[PDB]
Structures are given as structure tokens and as C-alpha cells.
PDB file of C-alpha atoms and ligand atoms in Angstrom:
ATOM      1  CA  UNK A   1    -191.338 105.644  -8.982  1.00 30.22           C
ATOM      2  CA  UNK A   2    -190.414 105.862 -12.622  1.00 27.03           C
ATOM      3  CA  UNK A   3    -191.229 108.755 -15.021  1.00 26.58           C
ATOM      4  CA  UNK A   4    -191.491 107.304 -18.770  1.00 24.73           C
ATOM      5  CA  UNK A   5    -192.073 110.053 -21.439  1.00 21.69           C
ATOM      6  CA  UNK A   6    -193.102 108.940 -25.102  1.00 21.99           C
ATOM      7  CA  UNK A   7    -191.171 111.247 -28.138  1.00 23.72           C
ATOM      8  CA  UNK A   8    -193.701 111.044 -30.607  1.00 22.60           C
ATOM      9  CA  UNK A   9    -194.072 113.142 -34.108  1.00 21.23           C
ATOM     10  CA  UNK A  10    -193.377 113.280 -37.661  1.00 21.84           C
ATOM     11  CA  UNK A  11    -190.061 112.810 -39.070  1.00 19.17           C
ATOM     12  CA  UNK A  12    -186.897 115.114 -38.452  1.00 20.71           C
ATOM     13  CA  UNK A  13    -188.506 117.900 -36.565  1.00 17.75           C
ATOM     14  CA  UNK A  14    -185.930 117.197 -33.520  1.00 18.66           C
ATOM     15  CA  UNK A  15    -187.150 114.609 -31.589  1.00 18.95           C
ATOM     16  CA  UNK A  16    -183.764 112.787 -30.690  1.00 19.73           C
ATOM     17  CA  UNK A  17    -182.072 116.411 -30.154  1.00 20.95           C
ATOM     18  CA  UNK A  18    -184.037 117.337 -27.543  1.00 21.34           C
ATOM     19  CA  UNK A  19    -183.927 114.153 -26.062  1.00 23.36           C
ATOM     20  CA  UNK A  20    -179.900 113.819 -26.705  1.00 24.09           C
ATOM     21  CA  UNK A  21    -179.934 117.181 -25.150  1.00 24.79           C
ATOM     22  CA  UNK A  22    -181.996 116.678 -21.877  1.00 29.67           C
ATOM     23  CA  UNK A  23    -179.615 113.221 -21.628  1.00 32.18           C
ATOM     24  CA  UNK A  24    -178.662 111.366 -20.590  1.00 33.42           C
ATOM     25  CA  UNK A  25    -175.802 109.936 -20.562  1.00 34.68           C
ATOM     26  CA  UNK A  26    -183.168 105.435 -27.590  1.00 33.19           C
ATOM     27  CA  UNK A  27    -183.307 105.507 -24.062  1.00 34.02           C
ATOM     28  CA  UNK A  28    -182.513 108.698 -22.113  1.00 32.42           C
ATOM     29  CA  UNK A  29    -182.214 109.019 -18.410  1.00 38.01           C
ATOM     30  CA  UNK A  30    -181.567 112.038 -16.400  1.00 38.85           C
ATOM     31  CA  UNK A  31    -182.984 113.313 -12.883  1.00 36.10           C
ATOM     32  CA  UNK A  32    -183.789 117.060 -12.432  1.00 34.87           C
ATOM     33  CA  UNK A  33    -185.231 119.251  -9.857  1.00 34.77           C
ATOM     34  CA  UNK A  34    -188.536 120.230 -10.118  1.00 32.35           C
ATOM     35  CA  UNK A  35    -190.093 122.622  -8.456  1.00 34.86           C
ATOM     36  CA  UNK A  36    -189.085 121.826  -4.958  1.00 31.06           C
ATOM     37  CA  UNK A  37    -188.638 118.190  -5.588  1.00 30.82           C
ATOM     38  CA  UNK A  38    -186.539 115.637  -7.090  1.00 27.99           C
ATOM     39  CA  UNK A  39    -187.919 113.689 -10.081  1.00 27.14           C
ATOM     40  CA  UNK A  40    -186.092 111.120 -12.344  1.00 27.79           C
ATOM     41  CA  UNK A  41    -187.374 111.127 -16.312  1.00 29.11           C
ATOM     42  CA  UNK A  42    -186.888 107.832 -18.589  1.00 27.57           C
ATOM     43  CA  UNK A  43    -187.285 109.610 -22.081  1.00 27.21           C
ATOM     44  CA  UNK A  44    -188.089 107.211 -24.774  1.00 27.08           C
ATOM     45  CA  UNK A  45    -187.215 108.316 -28.643  1.00 27.52           C
ATOM     46  CA  UNK A  46    -189.795 105.807 -30.001  1.00 25.70           C
ATOM     47  CA  UNK A  47    -189.163 105.827 -33.821  1.00 27.13           C
ATOM     48  CA  UNK A  48    -195.894 105.782 -20.610  1.00 25.35           C
ATOM     49  CA  UNK A  49    -196.577 108.497 -17.986  1.00 26.19           C
ATOM     50  CA  UNK A  50    -196.475 111.414 -20.807  1.00 26.18           C
ATOM     51  CA  UNK A  51    -196.591 112.166 -24.226  1.00 24.69           C
ATOM     52  CA  UNK A  52    -194.478 114.618 -25.643  1.00 20.15           C
ATOM     53  CA  UNK A  53    -195.561 115.356 -29.313  1.00 18.45           C
ATOM     54  CA  UNK A  54    -193.203 117.121 -31.391  1.00 15.20           C
ATOM     55  CA  UNK A  55    -193.502 119.221 -34.342  1.00 15.67           C
ATOM     56  CA  UNK A  56    -191.437 121.821 -36.414  1.00 18.05           C
ATOM     57  CA  UNK A  57    -192.526 125.066 -36.439  1.00 20.14           C
ATOM     58  CA  UNK A  58    -190.819 124.880 -39.710  1.00 19.64           C
ATOM     59  CA  UNK A  59    -193.052 122.180 -41.263  1.00 19.19           C
ATOM     60  CA  UNK A  60    -196.792 122.687 -41.104  1.00 22.50           C
ATOM     61  CA  UNK A  61    -197.292 119.006 -42.472  1.00 23.21           C
ATOM     62  CA  UNK A  62    -195.764 117.801 -38.704  1.00 26.74           C
ATOM     63  CA  UNK A  63    -198.179 120.374 -37.359  1.00 25.06           C
ATOM     64  CA  UNK A  64    -201.264 118.737 -38.624  1.00 23.11           C
ATOM     65  CA  UNK A  65    -199.503 114.985 -37.660  1.00 23.01           C
ATOM     66  CA  UNK A  66    -199.030 116.551 -34.398  1.00 21.51           C
ATOM     67  CA  UNK A  67    -203.110 117.399 -34.086  1.00 23.47           C
ATOM     68  CA  UNK A  68    -203.963 114.253 -35.886  1.00 24.27           C
ATOM     69  CA  UNK A  69    -201.916 111.897 -33.124  1.00 23.59           C
ATOM     70  CA  UNK A  70    -203.287 114.054 -30.225  1.00 22.36           C
ATOM     71  CA  UNK A  71    -206.759 113.390 -31.249  1.00 22.60           C
ATOM     72  CA  UNK A  72    -205.514 109.346 -31.648  1.00 27.07           C
ATOM     73  CA  UNK A  73    -204.064 109.556 -28.395  1.00 25.85           C
ATOM     74  CA  UNK A  74    -207.418 110.638 -26.648  1.00 21.94           C
ATOM     75  CA  UNK A  75    -209.516 108.011 -28.150  1.00 23.71           C
ATOM     76  CA  UNK A  76    -206.751 105.276 -27.292  1.00 20.69           C
ATOM     77  CA  UNK A  77    -206.415 103.406 -24.377  1.00 22.16           C
ATOM     78  CA  UNK A  78    -205.450 109.919 -18.275  1.00 16.83           C
ATOM     79  CA  UNK A  79    -202.144 111.161 -19.475  1.00 18.08           C
ATOM     80  CA  UNK A  80    -200.274 114.404 -19.902  1.00 21.09           C
ATOM     81  CA  UNK A  81    -199.758 115.564 -23.646  1.00 21.14           C
ATOM     82  CA  UNK A  82    -197.332 118.316 -24.135  1.00 22.00           C
ATOM     83  CA  UNK A  83    -197.658 120.041 -27.662  1.00 22.36           C
ATOM     84  CA  UNK A  84    -193.786 120.822 -29.106  1.00 21.40           C
ATOM     85  CA  UNK A  85    -193.174 123.161 -31.573  1.00 21.81           C
ATOM     86  CA  UNK A  86    -189.183 122.655 -32.125  1.00 23.52           C
ATOM     87  CA  UNK A  87    -187.022 124.813 -34.574  1.00 18.19           C
ATOM     88  CA  UNK A  88    -187.819 128.096 -33.139  1.00 17.27           C
ATOM     89  CA  UNK A  89    -184.298 129.614 -34.066  1.00 14.93           C
ATOM     90  CA  UNK A  90    -185.516 128.784 -37.904  1.00 15.54           C
ATOM     91  CA  UNK A  91    -187.190 132.458 -38.265  1.00 18.03           C
ATOM     92  CA  UNK A  92    -187.234 132.702 -41.769  1.00 15.03           C
ATOM     93  CA  UNK A  93    -188.547 129.202 -42.864  1.00 13.95           C
ATOM     94  CA  UNK A  94    -191.557 129.056 -39.754  1.00 17.01           C
ATOM     95  CA  UNK A  95    -195.107 127.571 -40.933  1.00 15.03           C
ATOM     96  CA  UNK A  96    -196.593 127.445 -38.101  1.00 12.96           C
ATOM     97  CA  UNK A  97    -197.231 130.902 -35.847  1.00 10.42           C
ATOM     98  CA  UNK A  98    -196.790 130.498 -31.918  1.00 11.75           C
ATOM     99  CA  UNK A  99    -200.263 131.235 -31.275  1.00 12.38           C
ATOM    100  CA  UNK A 100    -201.662 128.949 -33.611  1.00 14.79           C
ATOM    101  CA  UNK A 101    -199.634 126.179 -31.866  1.00 10.74           C
ATOM    102  CA  UNK A 102    -200.873 127.818 -28.661  1.00 13.41           C
ATOM    103  CA  UNK A 103    -204.420 128.183 -29.502  1.00 16.01           C
ATOM    104  CA  UNK A 104    -204.289 124.444 -30.870  1.00 15.95           C
ATOM    105  CA  UNK A 105    -203.211 122.903 -27.527  1.00 15.03           C
ATOM    106  CA  UNK A 106    -205.965 124.683 -25.550  1.00 14.31           C
ATOM    107  CA  UNK A 107    -208.755 123.369 -27.583  1.00 12.36           C
ATOM    108  CA  UNK A 108    -207.093 120.186 -27.754  1.00 12.76           C
ATOM    109  CA  UNK A 109    -206.112 119.930 -24.056  1.00 12.65           C
ATOM    110  CA  UNK A 110    -202.406 119.768 -24.593  1.00 12.64           C
ATOM    111  CA  UNK A 111    -199.729 121.586 -22.572  1.00 11.15           C
ATOM    112  CA  UNK A 112    -197.707 123.922 -25.122  1.00 14.01           C
ATOM    113  CA  UNK A 113    -193.878 125.015 -25.665  1.00 12.93           C
ATOM    114  CA  UNK A 114    -192.233 126.482 -28.513  1.00 14.00           C
ATOM    115  CA  UNK A 115    -187.972 124.768 -28.281  1.00 12.74           C
ATOM    116  CA  UNK A 116    -184.973 125.068 -30.408  1.00 10.79           C
ATOM    117  CA  UNK A 117    -182.699 122.243 -29.574  1.00 13.61           C
ATOM    118  CA  UNK A 118    -180.391 124.181 -32.244  1.00  9.89           C
ATOM    119  CA  UNK A 119    -179.706 126.321 -29.373  1.00 10.91           C
ATOM    120  CA  UNK A 120    -180.661 124.740 -25.703  1.00  9.46           C
ATOM    121  CA  UNK A 121    -183.724 126.839 -25.522  1.00  6.09           C
ATOM    122  CA  UNK A 122    -186.896 125.891 -23.555  1.00  3.53           C
ATOM    123  CA  UNK A 123    -185.319 122.227 -23.474  1.00  2.00           C
ATOM    124  CA  UNK A 124    -184.920 122.095 -19.366  1.00  2.00           C
ATOM    125  CA  UNK A 125    -188.476 123.626 -19.525  1.00  3.13           C
ATOM    126  CA  UNK A 126    -190.165 121.615 -21.541  1.00  3.38           C
ATOM    127  CA  UNK A 127    -189.010 118.559 -19.442  1.00  2.00           C
ATOM    128  CA  UNK A 128    -189.995 120.089 -16.274  1.00  3.81           C
ATOM    129  CA  UNK A 129    -193.127 121.011 -17.762  1.00  3.86           C
ATOM    130  CA  UNK A 130    -193.605 117.548 -18.250  1.00  2.00           C
ATOM    131  CA  UNK A 131    -193.045 116.673 -14.664  1.00  2.00           C
ATOM    132  CA  UNK A 132    -195.354 119.340 -13.272  1.00  2.00           C
ATOM    133  CA  UNK A 133    -197.790 118.253 -15.913  1.00  2.00           C
ATOM    134  CA  UNK A 134    -197.549 114.822 -14.412  1.00  2.00           C
ATOM    135  CA  UNK A 135    -197.945 115.673 -11.151  1.00  2.00           C
ATOM    136  CA  UNK A 136    -201.294 117.633 -12.030  1.00  2.00           C
ATOM    137  CA  UNK A 137    -203.021 114.808 -13.115  1.00  2.00           C
ATOM    138  CA  UNK A 138    -201.702 112.306 -10.252  1.00  2.00           C
TER     139      UNK A 138
HETATM  140  N1  GNP B 201    -181.993 124.791 -36.553  1.00  2.00           N
HETATM  141  C1  GNP B 201    -182.442 123.608 -35.805  1.00  2.00           C
HETATM  142  N2  GNP B 201    -182.106 122.599 -36.660  1.00  2.00           N
HETATM  143  C2  GNP B 201    -182.616 121.608 -36.058  1.00  2.00           C
HETATM  144  C3  GNP B 201    -183.370 122.215 -34.590  1.00  2.00           C
HETATM  145  N3  GNP B 201    -183.766 120.472 -34.017  1.00  2.00           N
HETATM  146  C4  GNP B 201    -183.335 119.592 -34.675  1.00  2.00           C
HETATM  147  N4  GNP B 201    -182.960 120.548 -35.569  1.00  2.00           N
HETATM  148  C5  GNP B 201    -182.083 119.560 -36.915  1.00  2.00           C
HETATM  149  O1  GNP B 201    -183.112 119.051 -37.441  1.00  2.00           O
HETATM  150  C6  GNP B 201    -182.872 117.350 -38.071  1.00  2.00           C
HETATM  151  C7  GNP B 201    -183.631 116.745 -37.626  1.00  2.00           C
HETATM  152  O2  GNP B 201    -183.307 116.603 -36.066  1.00  2.00           O
HETATM  153  P1  GNP B 201    -183.871 115.128 -35.507  1.00  2.00           P
HETATM  154  O3  GNP B 201    -183.686 115.455 -33.951  1.00  2.00           O
HETATM  155  O4  GNP B 201    -182.747 114.393 -36.194  1.00  2.00           O
HETATM  156  O5  GNP B 201    -185.003 115.064 -35.736  1.00  2.00           O
HETATM  157  P2  GNP B 201    -185.766 113.416 -35.624  1.00  2.00           P
HETATM  158  O6  GNP B 201    -187.101 113.894 -35.431  1.00  2.00           O
HETATM  159  O7  GNP B 201    -185.436 112.602 -34.674  1.00  2.00           O
HETATM  160  N5  GNP B 201    -186.117 113.115 -37.126  1.00  2.00           N
HETATM  161  P3  GNP B 201    -186.249 111.452 -37.543  1.00  2.00           P
HETATM  162  O8  GNP B 201    -187.979 110.857 -36.682  1.00  2.00           O
HETATM  163  O9  GNP B 201    -186.660 111.249 -38.680  1.00  2.00           O
HETATM  164  O10 GNP B 201    -185.386 110.689 -36.772  1.00  2.00           O
HETATM  165  C8  GNP B 201    -181.468 117.533 -37.880  1.00  2.00           C
HETATM  166  O11 GNP B 201    -180.299 117.844 -38.989  1.00  2.00           O
HETATM  167  C9  GNP B 201    -180.829 118.617 -36.774  1.00  2.00           C
HETATM  168  O12 GNP B 201    -179.599 119.361 -36.544  1.00  2.00           O
HETATM  169  C10 GNP B 201    -183.259 122.968 -33.773  1.00  2.00           C
HETATM  170  O13 GNP B 201    -184.153 123.461 -32.636  1.00  2.00           O
HETATM  171  N6  GNP B 201    -183.269 123.885 -34.961  1.00  2.00           N
HETATM  172 CA1   CA B 202    -200.831 115.314  -8.254  1.00  2.00          CA
HETATM  173 MG1   MG B 203    -184.413 110.367 -34.529  1.00  2.00          MG
END
């Protein structure tokens, strides 16, 4: 019983940072307990049992690319998709709002979370969600 997770997204959004925090220990293994049940995770920083599409909240381009990739996945080859807006710490140079990120997620059938790899914020919550989500579909 594997849980392979593919890390997708535009350049420099924080993909490896998120993976390296979670792991582990680019392929990153790690066994977490959600939310009563042990679950193992294999996180793939490619640049699947779930796709994590990362954008930077300070980079509106990576956000639109994120949406573009979401519709691509929806048309190709179902699997959970998590939309992640990383770098929530850079409050001055933010170009995408939370609600804009959360509203995008609903309409296009994503789970949504904002993280900051810099502050280790919601990184654990992200990967616990992925497990929960894989579990909704299975
Ligand atoms: N302030 C802040 N900086 C972050 C955060 N996450 C990543 N960064 C910074 O953003 C840069 C890119 O991070 P990285 O994880 O390498 O992104 P990437 O998506 O792997 N880039 P690439 O696809 O080009 O390899 C790094 O210099 C890193 O320190 C975050 O949450 N907050
Ligand atoms: Ca189930
Ligand atoms: Mg990288």
C-alpha cells in the first residue's frame, strides 16, 4: 500500500522546499499518522495517487499556470489534486489572495491550502490533507 504524490508547478514556487521539509530523510519518503491511521508517503519533486500543484502567492503567473495544469490533468489519463499557495509569509509581494486561491479550488475541483515553507506553516497539514483526500476517492 503505497501513497505516491507528485509535486508539480512553475519554477521557484517552493516545490523542493516543501518536499524537503516533509521529508525525508528528488524522492522523499515519510510515514505520518492520519487521522487515526498510519500512512506512508512518497513525495516526488519531478522537476500518482495524488497531485500537489504548487504556486507562489507572490507570483500570479505560477497561479495561472497552476490552473492551466489543473485543467490539463482533468483532460489527461480519478486522482486527488491539492492546490497549494506557498510563500504565505511574503505578505508585501503577494499577487494572489487566499480567497482567489480558495475560490479557484472549488470551481475546479481541488483541495486548497496556503503554506509557507519558510515558516514551516501548514506543511504538515498539507500532507495530511493529501492522505485524507486520497482516502475520499478510494
Ligand atoms: N519566503 C519564502 N521563501 C520561500 C518559501 N518557499 C520557498 N522559498 C524560496 O523560494 C526559492 C525557490 O524555492 P524552491 O523550493 O527551490 O522552489 P522550486 O519550486 O523547487 N524551484 P524550481 O522548480 O525552479 O526548482 C528558494 O530560494 C526558497 O528559499 C516560502 O514559503 N517563503
Ligand atoms: Ca475510502
Ligand atoms: Mg526544485
